[PDB]
Symmetry: C2
Subunit: 48 residues, 2 copies
């Protein structure tokens, strides 16, 4: 492991560490909810 590090360097092994996992995903399929709140904000704040 010392020899492998000697060739590749310090940053390469540390940055190659895994990140992605299947449980942290977030899905936004709602327009219906966000469109309603979007309109009432326009309606109340109307100036121009």
């Amino acid at each position: 492991i010392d020899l492998v590090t000697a060739e590749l360097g310090s940053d390469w092994p540390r940055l190659v560490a895994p990140t992605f996992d299947a449980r942290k995903a977030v899905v936004f399929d709602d327009r219906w909810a966000s469109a309603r709140e979007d309109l009432v904000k326009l309606w109340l704040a109307e100036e121009x």
Copy 2:
């Protein structure tokens, strides 16, 4: 070391092993010796 191997593969660490060492070098600076043996071989074997 298992994670590092997982990324890079099996062949990469094994082929990257060191080879060169300063003590195995071989120097041929002699023409004077090799030219003499070269001529006598011609002289004896002359046909054409």
